[PDB]
């Protein structure tokens, strides 16, 4: 009989973490448990604050979820354990830092292959923990963390909030977000995806062949650590951006009922439940910025990874008080910058970031005049339209904006790419208008024809929010 969670991460067509090592920073573990014996090496690194069966419960279970013989995701995979949580499951930021540093030092002294670091813990937002995680990620290590169990915005917690760490929320057997007493899984834009995190069978430290069911974002993160281990075993050269794009791509989409989340967090929270994978293809993801805040000249910026191309840029405000967005070059690399309106509470910038190798992409801009600009060169394709304005009240390869606004086209030389535009207009002053690319096509750009609150890609659906109205999707695929 297959545990529900292992079935859930099996894709609709299916057929081992061996050159990969998974580090676990957790409680002590019962390393001679039959699930993990011989597979998990205890480093005996310990850095824990003052306060076996109970001390070892959390870590033993998670080691089993990642690598357990019977009930593990990446059966047999190699693990190394560091103890940074005491017998009550409590640790410190400083201890975690020292642990992360220990891992980097070990790698320098004895290099191996890809490393996955599982951090099934959370504290409050920490500048230093976030910085250490980002540095370890930039050094080439893959970090996976729990979103947190506080039924709250994961951006207020660390390392959940950290740039460059894969942050994982918990879903149950009905693909709904997990309740944990009066709390439950965290959510919001710092969560990358969800994974099974309720009623997860795994190694119990009660006895060497015992099993226990546990729930939490820890268990969910352990699933994604296991999936990542297997993905990196199959494709060892993946960059973090390539790995994250695959995690997103292979996830089950739109299975979570978003009503569970607070209203404002619904647009920010990815509707993704992790799964194992089942010719070159265009992968894109939607990157939401931090909110700009209410300052009159506030801007928000959404950025792509170094090996990604920004193919489009949109923006969103709950009130609708916005001055739009522009694509601009920052450190020789295009970013998505959104502008607040004077008297607005703030805006999000929303980047569409894609893996498009050998792409010569550029921005073509026209100032206020409707205002128009086009990708005029032969062999070039339009991937996105953006528009910003200064004022306080307002074909092939062409963008059109309001007469009082600047217009920006993302143009790419990519001969192996075919793009089409799909419009859908609703007369009714309806709160939402959507239009989706066809199966096998990737949405590169989402916008509204020129009072919209904003626009954003959700998977391969373009969504336009209104306080006719036409949603405009640019859809591309490999030829």
């Amino acid at each position: 009989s297959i545990p529900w969670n292992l079935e859930r991460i099996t894709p609709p067509r299916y057929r081992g973490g061996s050159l990969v090592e998974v580090y676990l920073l957790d409680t002590s573990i019962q390393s001679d448990h039959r699930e993990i014996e011989g597979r998990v090496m205890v480093t005996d690194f310990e850095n824990v604050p003052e306060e076996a069966s109970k001390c070892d419960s959390h870590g033993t279970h998670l080691a089993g979820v990642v690598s357990g013989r019977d009930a593990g995701v990446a059966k047999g995979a190699s693990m190394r354990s560091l103890r940074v949580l005491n017998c009550q499951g409590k640790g410190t930021v400083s201890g975690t830092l020292i642990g992360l540093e220990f891992i980097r030092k070990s790698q320098l002294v004895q290099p191996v292959g890809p490393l996955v670091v599982l951090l099934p813990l959370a504290g409050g937002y920490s500048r230093v923990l976030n910085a250490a995680c980002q540095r370890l990620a930039r050094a080439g290590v893959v970090l996976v963390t729990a979103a947190g169990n506080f039924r709250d915005d994961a951006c207020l917690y660390s390392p959940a909030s950290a740039p460059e760490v894969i942050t994982v929320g918990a879903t149950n057997a009905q693909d709904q977000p997990v309740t944990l007493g009066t709390l439950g899984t965290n959510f919001g834009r710092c969560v990358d995806l969800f994974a099974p995190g309720e009623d997860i069978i795994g190694a119990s430290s009660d006895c060497s062949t015992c099993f226990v069911s546990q729930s939490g974002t820890s268990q969910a993160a352990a699933h994604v650590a296991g999936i990542a281990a297997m993905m990196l075993s199959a494709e060892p050269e993946l960059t973090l951006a390539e790995l994250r794009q695959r995690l997103i791509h292979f996830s089950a989409k739109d299975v979570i009922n978003e009503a569970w989340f607070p209203e404002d967090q619904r647009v920010l929270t990815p509707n993704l439940v992790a799964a194992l994978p089942p010719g070159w293809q265009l992968f894109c993801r939607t990157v939401w910025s931090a909110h700009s805040g209410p300052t009159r000249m506030a801007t928000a910026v959404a950025r792509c990874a170094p090996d990604e191309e920004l193919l489009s840029c949109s923006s969103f405000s709950r009130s609708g008080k916005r001055r739009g967005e522009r694509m601009e070059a920052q450190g020789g690399k295009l970013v998505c910058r959104a502008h607040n309106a004077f008297g607005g509470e703030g805006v999000y910038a929303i980047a569409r970031c894609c893996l498009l190798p050998q792409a010569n992409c550029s921005v073509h801009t026209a100032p206020p005049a409707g205002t128009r600009v086009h990708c005029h060169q032969q062999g070039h394709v339009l991937t996105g339209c953006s528009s910003h304005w200064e004022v306080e009240d307002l074909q092939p390869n062409q963008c059109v904006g309001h007469r009082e606004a600047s217009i920006h086209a993302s143009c790419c030389h990519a001969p192996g790419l075919e793009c089409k535009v799909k419009e859908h207009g609703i007369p009714a002053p309806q709160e939402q208008v959507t239009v989706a690319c066809e199966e096998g096509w990737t949405l590169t750009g989402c916008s509204a024809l020129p009072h919209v609150l904003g626009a954003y890609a959700v998977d391969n659906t373009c969504v336009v929010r209104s306080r006719a109205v036409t949603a405009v999707a640019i859809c591309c695929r490999s030829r």
Partner: protein, 92 residues
């Protein structure tokens, strides 16, 4: 320029222990000297301190057990980027 940060969740704070984070390209030799300078400056003002750890490999800096009284002093040390009060993390 150097700034101070502590956990916004007051029950999770651990006052009396501080992570002194130095600027990105600070060398271990410099980190070690900055730690000793802090201890010397502290001692002259009548404060005991303990350097619990010197960080190198990811972030340069050090972990110090000391009165928060010394934070203004510590923020003026050479190479300092910011200082963060230690805080708790928990099994999820």
């Amino acid at each position: 320029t150097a700034t101070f940060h502590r956990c916004a969740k007051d029950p999770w704070r651990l006052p009396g222990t501080y992570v002194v984070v130095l600027k990105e390209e600070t060398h271990l030799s410099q980190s070690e000297r900055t730690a000793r300078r802090l201890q010397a400056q502290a001692a002259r003002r009548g404060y005991l301190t303990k350097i619990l750890h010197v960080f190198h490999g990811l972030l340069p800096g050090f972990l110090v057990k000391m009165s928060g009284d010394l934070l203004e002093l510590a923020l003026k040390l050479p190479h300092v980027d910011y200082i963060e009060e230690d805080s708790s993390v928990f099994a999820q």
